[PDB]
């Protein structure tokens, strides 16, 4: 007789954003799904498992939301710190319990662990055949 029924585990929801770990000896890329809630720490159950010997299990939580308006999809990220070890976002200490994170945002967990967040959308393109024309305020040089 078997000893397994139904589905308990749950992962690989839907691609949306990623986390890049800035290290002077390497780099680490993490995948962020539309789980509404993301866990960061040492707990394997958490969303993102850092490589720190003293990384808080509940270190921090990230809210991944995806909504469609007009035609495209607008995603927003929220940072929540339980307050215990030490989490720094945007190079500054967090005080509020409802920080809004967007594309191109540097995040630091603990003190040394530093990573940048950016939306993955689906599949980026190269800058070899992608010219940037001035009209919708894209650049200024």
């Amino acid at each position: 007789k078997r000893q397994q029924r139904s589905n308990k585990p749950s992962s690989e929801y839907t691609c949306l954003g990623h986390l890049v770990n800035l290290i002077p000896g390497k780099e680490q890329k993490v995948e962020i799904t539309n789980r509404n809630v993301t866990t960061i720490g040492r707990s394997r159950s958490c969303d993102v498992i850092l490589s720190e010997p003293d990384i808080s299990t509940f270190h921090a939580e990230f809210h991944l939301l995806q909504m469609d308006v007009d035609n495209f999809q607008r995603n927003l990220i929220n940072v929540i710190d339980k307050s215990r070890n030490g989490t720094f976002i945007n190079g500054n200490r967090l005080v509020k319990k409802d920080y809004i994170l967007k594309n191109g945002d540097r995040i630091v967990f603990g003190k040394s662990c530093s990573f940048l967040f950016k939306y993955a959308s689906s599949s980026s393109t190269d800058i070899e055949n992608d010219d940037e024309k001035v009209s919708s305020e894209s650049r200024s040089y």
Binding site: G41, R42, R44, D54, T57
Partner: peptide, 10 residues
């Protein structure tokens, strides 16, 4: 998967 809880830092 059993991981060590939170700890103190320097």
């Amino acid at each position: 998967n059993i991981t060590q809880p939170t700890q103190q830092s320097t």
